[PDB]
Ligand binder design. Structure first.
Ligand SMILES: [Mg+2]
Ligand SMILES: [Mg+2]
Ligand SMILES: [Mg+2]
Ligand SMILES: [Mg+2]
Ligand SMILES: [Mg+2]
Ligand SMILES: [Mg+2]
Ligand SMILES: [Mg+2]
Lengths: 131, 185, 47, 141, 125
RNA sequence: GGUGACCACGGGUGACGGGGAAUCAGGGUUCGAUUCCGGAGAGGGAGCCUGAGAAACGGCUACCACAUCCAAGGAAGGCAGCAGGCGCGCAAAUUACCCACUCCCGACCCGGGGAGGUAGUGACGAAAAAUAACAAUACAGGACUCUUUCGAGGCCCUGUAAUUGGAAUGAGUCCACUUUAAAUCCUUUAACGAGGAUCCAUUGGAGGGCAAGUCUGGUGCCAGCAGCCGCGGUAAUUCCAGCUCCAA
C-alpha cells in the first residue's frame, strides 16, 4: 500500500454491456503479486464507486516482480452486471451460488432417464431409489 | 483436433567433420576467451551466421534495382546495425560477407556486462547473469546469451533487489549478521 | 565339444580386484571447459 | 554414346530405371525378396528365446572359440545364431530365456573373424545386459 | 602471474594465444634433460647417477610402509626393476619418477633435503 | 467395332492422394498412416425405412464369423470414438476434471458437447539453461639466471591448492499471492535452504583413420577386443582393471 500504484490503459466505454473495460498494470516492487480484493477497492475509490460492482481477473506479473497485467471490469450496477457476467467470477467472490454434481453422476442420471420410458412417476422415481 | 503448433527449429548444426584438431583449438579459444558453457552455443551462433550469409548471398546474385532486393537489404542491414554488429556507415550488401562470428559473440550480454566494467572475470559475469542481478532498462534478465541492441547498451544496470544496487542483502549476509549479533548483547 | 564355456569368464575371473582410487569431485560443465582453456591455451600480452 | 534428343524422356527414363536394377542396394531394397528372406522381417530388433549355446571358431589370422547362441524368434520363429558381445555374459545367460537380438552393424553380414553370424544378443530377461555385466542390476531371483 | 591480471585488465583490445608443448597429450613419461642442450653439449659425458642414501631412505620408507618393491612399483605404475635400481643406486634419477615414489612413500626424498619426516606436512597442511 | 511398343491389358504395391517432411551448390534422392483439404470404411458382404440430405451403422433387416444372458421359452451385440482391457509385437500414455476458451447442435441468452480445453504419463523431439565465482597461498625441477659451483630469482613448469574466505544465489522444503471452471504449473514473494557448497555428469574411447597412454598390474592365439585394417601364445601402445587424458 505504501509503494503500490495502479495504472490503466486501453480505456474504452460501452453501455453495450453497461460496462467499461480497460486493462490495468500494478507496481509491486518489493512485494509479491498483490491480492485482488484490496486493489478492487482501489479502483472503486479512485473512480468513486463501491468495491463490489468492480470485477477484475487475469493478473500475470512479469519477470522479477514489479508490473502485473490484468483486465479490470467496472459496471453500472450489481444487477445489470448480474444479468451479463460469466458465472465462475460470480462464484469466485460469492455472489452466485455454484453447487451441482460432477458430470459423471449427471451423465449416469441422464442415461437412467433415457432408460425409463415416458412415465413421469418412474422417471422422477429414477433418482429416488437410484440415489 | 488439438490446438498445438509443433513449430520448432534447431538453433545449431553439428560440424560435419569430427575430430579435427584445428577447429577444436579454434572453438576452444572462442569458448575460453568468451566464457561459453559448451560448443553447442558456438555452433548455434555459427549457424546464425551461416543463415545470414546465405540470405546475403542470395541477395547479391539478384539484380540490383529490384524492389525486393532494396527492401530486404535495407531491413537486413538495419536489423544488423540495430543489434550493433555493423558500423552505420557500412551500408552495402557485401561487407556482411566480410563480417565474422566474433562481433556476433560481442553482442552476447555476458560480454558487455564485462566491457562496461561492472563484471570482471567473464565467468563471474555469466554467473552474475544467472544470479538474476543485472537488470535491463526496467526488467531483470537472466540469460547469458542475450543479444543487446544500440538502444539498450546504456541502460544495463544492477537490479534493485540485488545486494549490489538497492537493499536486501543476501542470505549469507543475514546468516553472518545474526550469528555475530547472537554472541553478545 | 570345445568345452570353452568353462573358460567364458577366464580373464575377468582371474584378474585381481583393485579398488578404484578416490578422486576429488571434478569440476564439470563450464568450469571444466575453463580448465581446458587454461591448461592448453596460454595467451600472452603483446608488446 | 548416349542419346540427347529433345523429346527423348521415354528413352532416358526407361534406360535409367532399367539400369537402376543393376546395383545391389536398390535391388535388395525394392525387389522385396531380401526382406522376405530377412530373418528380422525388417525389424531393428526382435525378441528371441534361447535354444542352445554353441561356440564357434574364428578365421585364420585369429585363433579363438567364439561364444554364440542358437535362438528361435517368436514371430516367424526360425533359428539363427547370435553373439554374446562380452567376456562373462555367456555365464550370465541360462537356457530358454527371452533375448532381444539385434543386427551386427554392417547390415546382415558377418563381422571380423566371425563366420556367418550377423547378430548380437542384448536385453536378456527384461533386465539389461551390459548393466548386468557391470552388475548395475542383477539377475531376477 | 600478474601478467594474467594485466591480460584481464587489457580488456579493450589485444591478447593472442600460443599453446604449450603438450597441450592435452599424455606422455606418461618425461625426460629430465632439455635434450636440446644435450644435442648442443659436447664436453660433458658423465651422468650424476643417484646416491646411496637415496636408496637407503627408499628402503626405510618401504619397510615403514611394509611394501615390497613389487607393491611400490604397482603403486607408482612403473616397472619393479625401476625401484630396484633406485634402491641399488644407479637409477639415473628422473624427477617425475622420484616425485611419484615420493608421493607413495611418507618420507620426503625430493628436494635438497634427504628426508622430511612428513612430506609437505601432514595431509599437506 | 473400341484400346495398344507414344507400353494397352495383366500382375505387384510393405500405395489412401495432395498440401507438405527429411536431405541440401545446382540438378536431385527418399518419406509423407498422422491434426489442413479430398476420398473410403466402421467385424465381412448385401438390402433397406425415415429423412432436404445415409445405402447411416453410438439406424434397421438378412447371411457369414465371432460372442453375451438365459428359468432353455427366448432375448441382446459391434470402442478403425473418449478412455481403459486381451492379443500382437522392438514399438507406443490416465477406465482424471471441466464445458470457462473455440466453435457445434437443439424450440432455445438459459441445456448438451470423452468435439474441444485442463491436468496426469511422456530423455518422440525442439528452445533455453545449473553443477560455482572472486580474492588472498606452497615445493620441485629446468632453456635457465645471475659471484665459477655457493647465493640468487629474471622467469617457465608442478603443489591439501583450505583453513583459502566471506560475499550471491538457485536445487530444494516453503507462507501466501497469482493462475484456473476448480485446480496444477510458471512468475512474484516472505521463512529456512551450500565449502568435500558429499546439493558429486555422464556416456564412449585413448595403434590407424580418428583426439587421446608407446603408464602400470593381470592375461598368455586363452579369454576376449575389433564398424574396417588388425591386437592378443609371457615385455599386448588394441583384452581385463588402477591412474592419466581425449571427445560431446
Ligand atoms: Mg494399403
Ligand atoms: Mg503416410
Ligand atoms: Mg481427414
Ligand atoms: Mg459410412
Ligand atoms: Mg453400411
Ligand atoms: Mg549438479
Ligand atoms: Mg586400457
Amino acid at each position: 500500500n505504501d509503494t503500490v500504484t495502479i495504472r490503466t490503459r486501453k480505456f474504452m466505454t460501452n453501455r453495450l454491456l453497461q460496462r467499461k473495460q480497460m486493462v490495468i498494470d500494478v507496481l509491486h516492487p518489493g512485494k509479491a503479486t498483490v491480492p485482488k480484493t484490496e486493489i478492487r477497492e482501489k479502483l472503486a475509490k479512485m473512480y468513486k464507486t463501491t468495491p463490489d460492482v468492480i470485477f477484475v481477473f487475469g493478473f500475470r506479473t512479469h519477470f522479477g516482480g514489479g508490473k502485473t497485467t490484468g483486465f479490470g471490469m467496472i459496471y453500472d450496477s450489481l444487477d445489470y452486471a448480474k444479468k451479463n457476467e460469466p458465472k465462475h467470477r460470480l462464484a469466485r467472490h460469492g455472489l452466485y451460488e455454484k453447487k451441482k454434481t460432477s458430470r459423471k453422476q449427471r451423465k449416469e442420471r441422464k442415461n437412467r432417464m433415457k432408460k425409463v420410458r415416458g412415465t413421469a412417476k418412474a422417471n422422477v422415481g429414477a433418482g429416488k431409489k437410484p440415489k | 483436433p488439438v490446438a498445438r503448433s509443433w513449430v520448432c527449429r534447431k538453433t545449431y548444426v553439428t560440424p560435419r567433420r569430427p575430430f579435427e584438431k584445428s577447429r577444436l583449438d579454434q572453438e576452444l579459444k572462442l569458448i575460453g576467451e568468451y566464457g561459453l558453457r559448451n560448443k553447442r552455443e558456438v555452433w548455434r551462433v555459427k549457424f546464425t551466421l551461416a543463415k545470414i550469409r546465405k540470405a546475403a548471398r542470395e541477395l547479391l546474385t539478384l539484380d540490383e534495382k529490384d524492389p525486393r532486393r532494396l527492401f530486404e537489404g535495407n531491413a537486413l542491414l538495419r536489423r544488423l546495425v540495430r543489434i550493433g554488429v555493423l558500423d552505420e556507415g557500412k551500408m552495402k550488401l557485401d561487407y556482411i560477407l566480410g563480417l565474422k562470428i566474433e562481433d556476433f559473440l560481442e553482442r552476447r550480454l555476458q560480454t558487455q556486462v564485462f566491457k562496461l566494467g561492472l563484471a570482471k572475470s567473464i565467468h563471474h559475469a555469466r554467473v552474475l547473469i544467472r544470479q538474476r542481478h543485472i537488470r535491463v532498462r526496467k526488467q531483470v534478465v537472466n540469460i547469458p546469451s542475450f543479444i543487446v541492441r544500440l538502444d539498450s547498451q546504456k541502460h544495463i544496470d544492477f537490479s534493485l533487489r540485488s545486494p549490489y544496487g538497492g537493499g536486501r542483502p543476501g542470505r549469507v549476509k543475514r546468516k553472518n549478521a545474526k550469528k555475530g549479533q547472537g554472541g553478545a548483547g | 565339444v570345445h568345452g570353452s564355456l568353462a573358460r567364458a569368464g577366464k580373464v575377468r575371473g582371474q584378474t585381481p580386484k583393485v579398488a578404484k582410487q578416490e578422486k576429488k569431485k571434478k569440476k564439470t560443465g563450464r568450469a571444466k571447459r575453463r580448465m581446458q582453456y587454461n591448461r592448453r591455451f596460454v595467451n600472452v600480452v603483446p608488446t | 554414346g548416349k542419346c540427347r534428343g529433345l523429346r527423348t524422356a521415354r528413352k532416358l527414363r526407361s534406360h535409367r530405371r532399367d539400369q537402376k536394377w543393376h546395383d545391389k542396394q536398390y535391388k535388395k531394397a525394392h525387389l522385396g525378396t531380401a526382406l522376405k528372406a530377412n530373418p528380422f522381417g525388417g525389424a531393428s530388433h526382435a525378441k528371441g528365446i534361447v535354444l542352445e549355446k554353441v561356440g564357434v571358431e574364428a578365421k585364420q589370422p585369429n585363433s579363438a572359440i567364439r561364444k554364440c547362441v542358437r535362438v528361435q524368434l517368436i514371430k516367424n520363429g526360425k533359428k539363427i545364431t547370435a553373439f554374446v558381445p562380452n567376456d562373462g555374459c555367456l555365464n550370465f545367460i541360462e537356457e530358454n530365456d527371452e533375448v532381444l537380438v539385434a543386427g551386427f552393424g554392417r547390415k546382415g553380414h558377418a563381422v571380423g573373424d566371425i563366420p556367418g553370424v550377423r547378430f548380437k544378443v542384448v536385453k536378456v530377461a527384461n533386465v539389461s545386459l551390459l548393466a548386468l555385466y557391470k552388475g548395475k542390476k542383477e539377475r531376477p531371483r | 602471474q600478474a601478467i594474467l591480471a594485466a591480460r584481464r585488465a587489457a580488456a579493450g583490445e589485444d591478447v593472442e594465444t600460443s599453446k604449450k608443448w603438450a597441450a592435452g597429450q599424455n606422455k606418461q613419461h618425461s625426460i629430465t634433460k632439455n635434450t636440446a642442450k644435450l644435442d648442443r653439449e659436447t664436453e660433458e659425458l658423465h651422468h650424476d647417477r643417484v646416491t646411496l642414501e637415496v636408496g637407503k631412505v627408499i628402503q626405510q620408507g618401504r619397510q615403514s610402509k611394509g611394501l615390497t618393491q613389487k607393491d611400490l612399483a604397482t603403486k607408482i605404475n612403473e616397472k619393479p626393476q625401476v625401484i630396484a635400481d633406485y634402491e641399488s643406486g644407479r637409477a639415473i634419477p628422473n624427477n617425475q619418477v622420484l616425485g611419484k615414489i615420493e608421493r607413495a612413500i611418507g618420507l620426503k626424498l625430493r628436494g635438497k633435503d634427504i628426508g622430511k619426516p612428513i612430506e609437505k606436512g601432514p595431509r599437506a597442511k
